[PDB]
């Protein structure tokens, strides 16, 4: 079984998963790799949205088998400051593209060699086999080289050419002229007119020698449109000078009006591709797929410029015929071969760029979710609810370790609310929770949080987003962990766990691709490729897991946290589960982290990759566990650098190197009691002396091995702030600032004249038609304008996000 060798091999689990297996480099193919990656992944795209660093990163990844986290987090001096974690991820992604292109090039080179052998057995390949195949810097021009090969040599797997050659300026020369923008190669006259040469070749397929002229022009057009140089020049022309024309289809004119997303570009005219926004072209292509819109990509001319080259000057009247034939051959080639294919290529590139922006937006949103810290374990009480109309509210007190301790149900109306408040206060007094979190669903969250505040002040109370809790509730894992609890109780535990630490909850509830895709990272998330979006999200998870480090001894004791050691560097689903299985079977919990290889069977390369990103809670151990404890194991420091720590501590204590009493362990076990002593050590002078001894540059590593001994796994996440009023508005309302289109038409229900007209929106937002339109402050009520109770649809003219109030319009003139 593949899983068996994957768990048994010595390479990172994520290295075997990739389709293109990681094969070593040569330092000459590696340099070409770096140049190609730098040129292609760091080139300006078509829509508005150091090489030694790439060389070092590629060398690490492909020869040292260092995962992107281990390069980012322990190889900074090699890649920084010009390469970061996401840059390393992009480099490793583009390595796959380089390998694919190289394999394609090798296959095509072998084909061209076999074809050369076959021809030698019998045009031919003299420098094209070298010039083209060797000079293939993209998959697109690889198609240009191959398809050009198929045009001529594709016939043989084991006479219109006469006219085409008698057409002047052989296609390679036409490509040269186009690339130079001037007639580098002159045309070749003939001592006759096209028809006379036509009589020679007009025999069976093309009688009526005009037909042989048509055939010859078609052959010339094929040869021109298949020429790699003409392909390059025309693709560049499309890239720089490309317009986007859009019109709505019969199905599109009617159903796209100020609310369909394609309204802003329902009609376009000469919209340059350079001005396409982040995801605008993705929306354009989605609208075109829906059949309510039609587009085309062109430059309008360019044909007039091109025709000047494949042409001759004199007016002999026997070259005007040749000139006209050449002009119309170029016309046909451009109109039916080059324009269409170049439009297809440009459309694919633009759509892929829009997809990439959408994926990046989803990744950034996930980053913001996972980069939100814990709160300041802690006993967290989580309150969750629903419409609340004949539906109770559940609050769950989740222990600091993350395990729910107990729950409480909180189901004329005034006395019932009073009794609920009394029982909630009783619960809070009995079991004091550090933080009370209220889920975010609607306006009722504000009232719930305010009541909780009124209770607590007689200890914080914070509103919490409710979107991962819903996914947890609907998931089967919630049923598995809590067979007795109702769904709303699952929401409370999810909210408490997320507030305690989002990463630990996001990884546990987003256990599969389907679960992660349930979340809403971006409106167009559903249209991007599933593989790329999933890879981006898992890369964000890996980054935040390695930048946090996963505490081993807690993932075992509390199996809720097991999901975190999937995203550890070096240590994957199979590898992580195998490590957990080994720990469980041995019935032993890591007193020490160099113990990984000692008690488990994980290879040198995996240990190197993973072990920097595993935490050991050395302050929590006691009883029989006191028997064996390596004190450095409680930190971000890794067992290749454990000698430099035990020198840095000795030097910071000014221990006499000549005293047999300089115990380097005891020096650390004094520095980890008094970390302020490490401030008196000159790390730059210490690093220069390590470099002189031949240990290499370690300046940045020593600053980490200091900052880490100053605080064991120093958390860098931004603290759990309370959401800004904008956050509350977009959370409880469940729509974004873009969704609140000032001037949007909304169906609202009128409730009652408190001097204005209170209209309740379906979005849970109060709508106040202004008295200006109402025209009655002390005058008779606005009943004449509209009857109270029913629903009307109007247009927004103002917003009150801090109060959940939005202006409306009564006049149809505003509606227009």
């Amino acid at each position: 079984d593949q899983d068996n060798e994957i768990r048994a091999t010595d390479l990172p689990e994520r290295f075997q998963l990739r389709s293109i297996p990681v094969k070593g480099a040569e330092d000459d193919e590696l340099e070409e790799e770096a140049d190609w990656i730098y040129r292609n992944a760091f080139a300006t795209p078509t829509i508005s949205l150091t090489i030694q660093k790439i060389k070092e990163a590629l060398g690490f990844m492909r020869n040292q088998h260092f995962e992107v986290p281990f390069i980012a987090f322990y190889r900074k001096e090699y890649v920084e400051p010009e390469l970061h974690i996401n840059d390393l991820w992009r480099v490793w992604q583009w390595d796959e593209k380089w390998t694919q292109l190289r394999i394609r090039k090798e296959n095509l080179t072998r084909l061209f060699e076999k074809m050369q052998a076959y021809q030698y057995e019998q045009r031919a390949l003299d420098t094209t086999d070298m010039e083209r195949l060797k000079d293939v810097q993209s998959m697109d021009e690889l198609k240009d080289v191959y398809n050009h090969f198929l045009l001529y040599y594709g016939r043989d797997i084991p006479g219109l050419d006469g006219l085409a050659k008698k057409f002047g300026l052989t296609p390679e020369q036409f490509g040269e002229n186009l690339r130079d923008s001037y007639q580098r190669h002159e045309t070749e006259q003939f001592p006759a007119e096209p028809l006379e040469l036509a009589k020679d070749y007009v025999c069976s397929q093309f009688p009526t020698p005009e037909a042989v002229l048509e055939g010859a022009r078609y052959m010339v057009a094929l040869q021109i449109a298949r020429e790699p140089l003409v392909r390059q020049v025309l693709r560049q022309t499309f890239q720089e000078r490309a317009k986007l024309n859009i019109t709505p289809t019969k199905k599109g004119r009617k159903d796209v009006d100020e609310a369909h997303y394609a309204y802003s570009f329902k009609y376009l005219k000469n919209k340059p591709v350079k001005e396409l926004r982040d995801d605008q072209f993705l929306k354009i292509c989605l609208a075109e797929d829906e059949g309510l819109l039609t587009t085309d990509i062109s430059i309008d001319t360019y044909f007039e410029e091109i025709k000047q080259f494949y042409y001759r000057d004199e007016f002999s009247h026997q070259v005007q015929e040749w000139n006209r034939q050449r002009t119309m051959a170029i016309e046909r080639a451009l109109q039916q071969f080059l324009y269409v294919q170049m439009a297809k290529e440009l459309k694919n590139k633009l759509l892929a760029e829009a997809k990439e922006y959408v994926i990046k937006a989803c990744s950034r949103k996930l980053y913001n979710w996972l980069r939100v810290a814990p709160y300041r374990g802690i006993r967290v009480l989580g309150i969750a609810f629903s419409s609340a109309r004949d539906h109770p509210v559940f609050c769950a007190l989740v222990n600091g370790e993350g395990e729910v301790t107990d729950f409480l149900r909180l189901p004329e109306e005034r006395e019932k609310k009073a009794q609920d408040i009394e029982t909630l206060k009783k619960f809070l007094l009995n079991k004091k929770p550090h933080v009370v979190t209220v889920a975010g669903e609607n306006r009722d969250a504000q009232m719930l949080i305010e009541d909780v505040k009124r209770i607590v002040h007689e200890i914080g109370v914070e509103l919490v987003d409710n979107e991962l809790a819903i996914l947890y509730m609907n998931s089967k894992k919630s049923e598995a962990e809590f067979r007795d609890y109702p769904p709303v109780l699952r929401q409370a535990v999810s909210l408490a766990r997320r507030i305690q630490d989002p990463l630990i909850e996001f990884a546990q509830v987003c256990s599969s691709d389907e679960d992660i895709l349930c979340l809403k990272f971006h409106p167009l998330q559903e249209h991007v490729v599933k593989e790329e979006l999933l890879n981006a999200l898992y890369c964000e998870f890996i980054n935040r897991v390695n930048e946090v480090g996963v505490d081993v001894n807690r993932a075992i004791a509390h199996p809720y946290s097991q999901a975190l050691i999937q995203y550890v560097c070096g240590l994957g689903p199979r590898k992580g589960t195998h490590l957990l299985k080994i720990l469980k079977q041995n019935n032993t919990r890591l007193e020490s982290r160099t113990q990984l290889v000692t008690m488990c069977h994980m290879g040198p390369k995996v240990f190197m990759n993973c072990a920097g990103f595993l935490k050991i809670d050395t302050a929590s151990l006691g009883d029989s566990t006191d028997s064996y404890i390596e004190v450095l194991d409680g930190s971000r420091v890794h067992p290749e650098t454990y000698e430099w720590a035990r020198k840095m501590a000795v030097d910071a204590l000014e221990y006499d190197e000549s005293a047999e009493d300089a115990n380097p362990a005891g020096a650390l076990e004094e520095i980890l009691e008094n970390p302020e002593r490490l401030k008196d050590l000159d790390l730059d002078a210490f690093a220069e002396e390590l470099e002189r001894q031949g240990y290499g540059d370690k300046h940045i590593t020593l600053y980490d091995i200091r900052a880490e001994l100053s605080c064991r796994y120093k958390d860098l996440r931004t603290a759990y702030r309370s959401p800004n009023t904008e956050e509350i508005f977009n959370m409880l309302t469940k729509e974004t600032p873009e969704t609140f289109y000032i001037g949007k038409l909304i169906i609202c229900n009128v409730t009652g004249i408190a001097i204005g007209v209170k209209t309740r929106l379906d979005n849970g937002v109060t709508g106040f038609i202004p008295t200006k339109f109402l025209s009655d402050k002390v005058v008779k009520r606005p009943e004449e304008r509209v009857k109270v109770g029913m629903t009307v649809h109007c247009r927004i003219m103002k917003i009150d996000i801090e109060k959940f109030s939005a202006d409306l319009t009564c006049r149809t003139s505003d509606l227009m």
């Binding site: 030097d651 000014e654 302020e676 401030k679 008196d680 000159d682 002078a685």
Partner: peptide
């Protein structure tokens, strides 16, 4: 004998 010490000669002021 063969010996080395990281020098406490540092002018960086104990990181405050």
């Amino acid at each position: 004998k063969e010996v080395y010490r990281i020098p406490k000669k540092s002018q960086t002021e104990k990181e405050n």
